[model samples]
Target: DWTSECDVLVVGSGGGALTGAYTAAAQGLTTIVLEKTDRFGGTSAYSGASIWLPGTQVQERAGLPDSTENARTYLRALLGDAESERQDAYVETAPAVVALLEQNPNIEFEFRAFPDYYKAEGRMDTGRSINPLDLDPADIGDLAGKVRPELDQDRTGQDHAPGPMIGGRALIGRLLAAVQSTGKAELRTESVLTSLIVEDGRVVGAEVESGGETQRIKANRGVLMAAGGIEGNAEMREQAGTPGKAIWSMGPFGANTGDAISAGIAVGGATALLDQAWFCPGVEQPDGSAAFMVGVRGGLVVDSAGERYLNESLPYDQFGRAMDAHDDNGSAVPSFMIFDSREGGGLPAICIPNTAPAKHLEAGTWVGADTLEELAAKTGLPADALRSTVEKFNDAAKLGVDEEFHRGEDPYDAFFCPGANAALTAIENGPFYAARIVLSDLGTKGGLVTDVNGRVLRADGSAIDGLYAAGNTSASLSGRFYPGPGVPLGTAMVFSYRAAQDMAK
Candidate 1:
């Protein structure tokens, strides 16, 4: 193997890793970013790119009443005493994370008043649940080649739009532009960090194999691990105690393995959330791929046996996490999100306000039938039971109340169902459809554990010298619950910047 050295080595090219690289490079460190995939922006570039940064600097300038303390209260209410330490760090450091991006003129967010996922007691702000960015592609002017436009979520020529509809992708595009503009960062694509080079009980460097050749890169200052998670790595998920046949994640394809986690564990780094994943009720595709029909109305997520589970109109991630709580041994049933002709044609589809039209149905990945019995037969649901469920739902819709399951009680659903003094009614008309739903994981939960400073922690919670982890390659700071929207991206930027600053030797 050949040898190379740099002041900082960031593994993975996702938003977190890129932020780490940019942060480190900004401080005059010679930063080198390595990505296993041929493209950059890991999941971030190929993602909805809608980063949720609450108490973000932009929000503060806009006069939003967001602060670390308020964010802390909201986060604690979500975690409910579990993983308090991690949640504390996440909430406390969130502002700096947003500051790092916003401080750079290249990065800007268009804060939208999205509905809260769980508008329960102790939630800090009601309407300011999610904050998405409007990042420009010019930021990474020279690093454009690093971002992958071929990923599943990366829009093609025919799918390009210049409006806020696809704003998430635009955010990632902007981050890429920034990195490109500054030639200080170097990104190597299709290069796999197969092995971590550890010696003398201390972390050192990595062994990468790209294009049939192996090489060794030594980091003098620190090696930042942002190489994502084991969402696609069935072996790692199984080894980390995750149960089930397969893992479901809405993350990009590069996440299909756990090279980073495997390498970290090789050096005695502890991992949490291995058995758990961020699950969502996702619609299935013919090629086994899935789409997250998140935060949309009209669809009802029913368990494997065909029963409504949580509040149908809740934020997608929270509902997904809640569904995971119902799974036996961390394995949830493949749910069937049922929608009907009436709901399909009504305001929920094309004309609805405060909602995005259902996009999952356009490809016909869902099974559609004109009658309840036909839909049940097509979707393998018991006809009588399905019909009974529908009847009960229709009765509720007619009476302007959901007698069963308390479907429309939440303020969010109430906002959508103004006509309903109670629940937003279910589908009962012709052209019923069912999409096989599973716990669509956002990403794997477990990875290397780090602290408020983004330093990789020892098994006993002490910082490891010259080692740092961020994003999916590390344990999730949000434990047991999702506090607000844009959590994944927010934490990624926060820790990445923190880690970079910590490693600014």
Candidate 2:
């Protein structure tokens, strides 16, 4: 028997999924949102929520000039000649979609000052990313309990109060409110979609499991999947050749296991870019979890041979790829980020696990020494090589230049650095410190291949009727390189909005 029916059925509850639900409901389409976990928002609730959409009204309001042509230039510089149509469509639809969202009473945004990942003419040195305005949890009422808290809260089992929500929580809170206010959308949590139901070569419904029972929810128009990628799936990561293990991924636990992607594949969807991820450096915590490493201010990452490799100031993804590519006889697999007692002994990067330095030292994840020679002996790094590398780096730091690797050449390089020289600051003060750094990722960025309208395609490149995918479940339009901050969320919002529009037509 059919448990329910809706004009639009949205699977997953991340930013993209809720955006689709909101757009469809606002368009007078009856919509239903299904989430697999107890929480409504997925990994998105744990993210920074920087939506990268150039030429947006947010940018204009910030007095920053931008255009579609300039954005295209930047995309071409990074992604090159691939998925051109998808890229162009993203640029065309982002501003219009953002404008429509802003019209909703619950949704608002403002520009963030984060720099673009790369240095290019079209790149916004002052950043073109937009963040959702902070929302009072009181606005959402009891539904606020269903939003996933940040990793810190996850570690401590603490609940967020009814105050100003920040980061991804704010974004999800606002979107959740907007979707529910439509009076046409129903959200069901702990309801997992098992598979899509197809008849006459078109998807018409989904098989779902909840409360130890099975049910069929038919969709009169289409099924939009914004569930997420396979970063949390150990088997999928290995099968796809993605370079990191599940332990290194920063996504929410017990979620994003490729169920939606697997369902799409079972129904004949074609996929691309499965081997790639949004990569970043990570530090292992004493609790055996990983923390994303970002914005290093006074540290130099070195290999086991006590040698510096890539510029430490590069964008997280770009540097993460460098970590993957380096094969100095396996010496670079677990590289070392070395710093000193300067800056009150705090780490240069964000360590999300929140473990104390003493605990990390106890777990052998971090090492400290009163002298560089003592650190070299404790870590088995060659004494002479380590000392020479430090001396050279200090001289270059004094000159405010990285002669070997050009560390501070871009605005992103100095984003979190202090003093006049920024990333060129010296690590002269001892009791020196070092922590093991490994490859990590925000999420995998590949799954069903979709057109600009977000309709999933078959092997013949023809649209699969009544099927759509966005977010990490779709092949990334940006290709291999991350163009800038917010690309994932930005593209997710635009494509899901376009998907809803196409279904309405």
Candidate 3:
């Protein structure tokens, strides 16, 4: 027996899930959204909201040279043709998704100047990602308070600042406003889906535990599961052999533990890419957590043996892989980012929720000294080796070329550093610092396998009727490569939109 009914049920309140719910409700379908936590917008809320839905109306409006064909060429250069059908669906549907989203007055996006991660054919050195406009908290009324706060603020028990909500908050707030305006959707929180309710051969409803009670809610058309990844589940991480600890992941704490992925698995759905993630080099925090570290304009990273191992300016994912590659030899995993006092003793790279240098120094997350040798001693790195490495890097900086690692050979390396040989800055300004870096993930990139229309598939090339998956809950289409900024959110929105359209059919 069911306690309630809706034409569509969307699980997990992320960008992908909310996008699906809005699409379903906008089409006049009775839609219900379920979020496990009190706040909506899971990790998507903490994202930069830079969506890489290439060749969209936003790009055209912004007068950029990006097109679907160009995006296809770039993607094909990297990912080959393994999931070509899906690739086609994603690129083909991007413009439509943006167009439809813009039809709602609450939603608007603008082009931002970010670089594509690679310098492949058809790649844009100046990227093609779009960001939702900053939203005023007053416009959304009380719903703004329900959206998840920024990463720095949320983790520390702080509330949203009294101003326009930006980044992920804007995206979430706008979507929530659009969904509510439809008057055909019910938004819920603290509604955890315990299991999928299957009758005969398809998923017809979901068993959710809300407010400490169980209720079976029927979905007449379909259930779109964009819940999240297993990034927060230690057992799943071990079982799947995904690198990085659950605590190091950037997802909302205690969220994205693979609830939807596990439900799909129980109902005979297949999985793939179980060992992958949108990996990044994280700055170890004072409380033993990690902060997303990116946009490195200066400094050099060294292994425990005091050896310069990678181009500090490589795309964050590739940089992260460099750190992970040395995990076996115990030469990495707490790689020290040695920098000078040029930036007034602050890290040259951007650290999310950046803490005071005093706090980090007090917690020993960062160490300082007046010389390279003294800094090496503090970090337990071989003094001679550290000195030699810094000398070589400084020489490269003066010569304006990195002969060994080819640091400035790519555009991404210098994106954050513009003038004066840019990416190869010298570490000569004394009073040095070294902060601990660890392998952290935006989220685990492995889960349910889906078809072109976002239908969850079985192990034997069959679709499970009435079930769909997107975002990190579904296996990523890009395989081992992180294509560019916003690929996660872009693909999530596209596939979730496709899933809702399929349900409409």
Candidate 4:
């Protein structure tokens, strides 16, 4: 209805989007970010802030053995041989992205101990996949308080192999904060994008809806689609053939809806458009939001039928994909994570949310029971299936072998148990407890296909000049796998940097 203008318009203020905006602005381009939510960082802040930068300069400085070839090989093994160009871009330019963030005074990054995630696998990296920031909360000062506290209290020694999100979230927060401080970029929050402004077969701008008032912002240079995923967009979910996302569950931060995604499609962007991303099973709380847990030190995860699916504690991407594959009726809801009296009693006194339920159970948020039967009855799970499952697991515990479902085979399993006898046993004890865990997809992975430089590609697979995309808003470069932690942020940062570089030329 109204009108405005900007050199670069970034949709979504999360990790990928904000970084893209900052990078564009730093190149002296007039940039603005339209965030659908009041807060920024999108899902970046909400996640375990670990950016995977395999064989980057930071890792080289850390004295870890890594190379661009290894990064490419590791990623290709997961993504398959089809996605060659995108994998190359992600691997080659990751270090450059890390360097670009370091240019910001408020931002700093470092490599955590080498070989953090997936250390045991032969194809896995020995080191250099994950890099975190040496963020002094005091550096960002009050800004740090605005970001999620969990971003700072990283899992102590829970460093997965080549996966270190130690300070990745904080870095994104600081980048967004830096842009806010600058006069060149404006952040409009709670602005819903109604549609796209297409002119002569080119995407020119967007029609934004904010506070019941619709406004038009014309992007002169180009529009970078960094909007988060389509998980919360039920219509998109329905279109993607997903069981409509649960209304009560909140998507990633600022990712509650797919406003930008819809607008892009309306303007003529061909989307990859899947309902789920490669991530972990979501644990929905009494409150709206679902917890995307790594299950480092939490209870085990089961299927809706009250049976074991994957390892109770697998990597986030692997477990998440497993959930999507297993989902019927499109809900992708998982079973509950069951704990017994012994698990409740044996766990360390201090329990972090989504980790152990020490604090949650103490707060009465987690359900507890004296016996499995009572616990199953409370959650309304099939009582016999629940009891039999637990009994079967307990039997496996007796022989110290998990014959049916191996509970602990991944790197994350080791982090969750410090003093445990074996990673293979089920929680077999009195005072049984169970928490409902659902298969919460991170967001839709499919979006406007783009080239290595983050440039949105056309039907002919040619880069759209001045048009780029990053974050969940764009098609995920990695199709069926995740190489390490911070893949989203790392891709966002790398592609953002490459996009800027290409624009500069």
Candidate 2 per-residue lDDT, tens place, 240-305, comes to 888877888888887899888999999999999999999888887766667888887778988899
> What is the per-residue lDDT of model 3 for residues 1-505, given as tens digits with 9 covering 90 to 100?
8999999999998899999999999999999999999999999999999998988889989999989999999989999998988988988999999998999999999999889998789889989999999998999999999999998799889979787999999999999999999999999999998899998999999999987889999999999999999999999999998988898899998998999999999999999999999999999998988999999999999999999888889898999888898776567998999999889989998888777788999999999999988999999999999999999999999999988888987878877885348898899888999999999999988999999889999999899999999999999999988889999999999999999999999
Give candidates' CA RMSD values in order: 4.1, 1.4, 1.0, 5.4
Q: Candidates ranked by lDDT, best first?
A: 3, 2, 1, 4
Candidate number with the higher lDDT (1 or 2): 2
Candidate with top TM-score is 3
Q: Of the pair 2 and 4, which is ahead by lDDT? A: 2
TM-scores for candidates 1 onward, in order = 0.86, 0.97, 0.99, 0.83
**Model 1 lDDT per residue over 1-505, tens place:** 4478888888987778878888887667888888776566655654555565666666666676767676677767766777677677776676676666666666666566544556555454444433446533453454443445533325223332333323445555555555554667776877888877776765678788888989899887788888877887766677776533243455665454877777877777877777766555565655466556554456566665566656666656666656766776433456676776665443342110112225445655567777878877776677887777777766777776766666666655655543454445557666777766566666776788778767777799877777888888888877545555667777787788888888885
Model 3 spans with C-alpha error above 4 angstroms = none
Worst ten in a row by lDDT for model 3: 411-420
Which parts of model 1 have CA positions greater than 4 angstroms off?
81-83, 120-146, 150-168, 241-247, 322-332, 343-365, 414-418, 421-423
TM-score for predicted model 1 compared with the true structure: 0.86
Ten-residue stretch with the least lDDT total in model 4: 156-165
Query: lDDT tens string, model 4, 1-505?
Result: 4378888888776677777787778878888788776556655665555677677667767786667787777776666677688888888877777777767776666666423344432244334555445455555555554443342142232212232223445665578667765657887777766776777777677788788878898888788877777777777777786532544233443355666666666655667746546555555554434555553454555665667766665666666666667777632364567875655353322222344466446544367888777776766677788778777776766676666656555545555556233565567656877665555655556677777777777666766555677777778877756556667777877777676666556
